[PDB]
Amino acid sequence: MKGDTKVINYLNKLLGNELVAINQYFLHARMFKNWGLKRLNDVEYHESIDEMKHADRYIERILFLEGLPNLQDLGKLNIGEDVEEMLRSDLALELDGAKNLREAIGYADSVHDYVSRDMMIEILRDEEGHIDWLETELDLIQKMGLQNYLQAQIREEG
């Protein structure tokens, strides 16, 4: 079905954001894994899989709307050297994505693409949830201290 051109560009810009989040969350998960920090490996791997699934939703909507998914442009990953710096790059990436999402949702709404808009509010709701996890971890590091925080990651939660 023929979509609005500027909705298709927002969808590609947003898909482009997911492509860096997938790679950055996946490499952080495996870095935490290699350090023995199992709980951090499991939560970050899951966030990686969520972004994978978001990228898949945009690829499919762009194709239905008769656009072309751009999987060729990868933005700049910010890895970090320690646990706290790694969790802050992630919080910062999420905060930018949420910002681009707010803008795209408002545009899709103004051109009456209500289905693309609802897709994006669902993805925004998942991003606000990752933002909540990252903020609480970063605070817990300050409150219990890094050595206590690292000790809490070596066994997995349920």
- Rule CB under 8 A: which residues touch a copy of itself? 1, 23-24, 26-27, 30-31, 33-36, 56, 59-60, 63-64, 69, 71-74, 76-77, 95, 102-103, 105-106, 112, 114-115, 118, 121, 124-125, 128, 131-132, 135-137, 139-140, 143-145, 147-152, 154-155, 157
Name the token pair of 88.
Answer: 């802050």
| Residue of 28, 61, 117, 130 interacting with Mn ion (CB under 5 A) | 130
Compute the half-sphere exposure of residue 1: CA atoms within 13 Å on the CB side of its CA: 7
Name the token pair of 139.
Answer: 């605070």
Count Cβ neighbours within 10 Å for each residue of 117-131 and write b for 16 or more, e otherwise: bebbeebbeebeebb
Residue 60 binds which entry of ligand HEM, a copy of itself, Mn ion, none, CB below 5-8 Å type-dependent:
a copy of itself
Q: Does 127 bind Mn ion (CB under 5 A)?
A: yes
What does the alpha-carbon distance between residue 83 and residue 99 come to, in Å, rounded to a whole number?
25
18 vs 113 by CB, closer to Mn ion: 18
Q: Please, what is the minimum distance in Å from the beta carbon of residue 85 to Mn ion?
A: 18
Helices (H) and strands (E) in the chain, counts: 5, 0
Site for ligand HEM in 44-73 (CB under 6 A): 49, 52-53, 55-56, 71
Check whether 46 is labelled as a binding-site residue: yes
The DSSP code for 1 is: -
Q: Does 137 bind Mn ion (CB under 5 A)?
A: no
Each residue 1-30 as x (binds ligand HEM by CB under 6 A) or -, in order, gives: ---------------------xx--x----
Cα 62 to chain centroid, rounded = 19
Q: Which residues contact 90 (CB under 8 A, 6 or more apart)?
A: 24, 25, 28, 44, 47, 130, 134
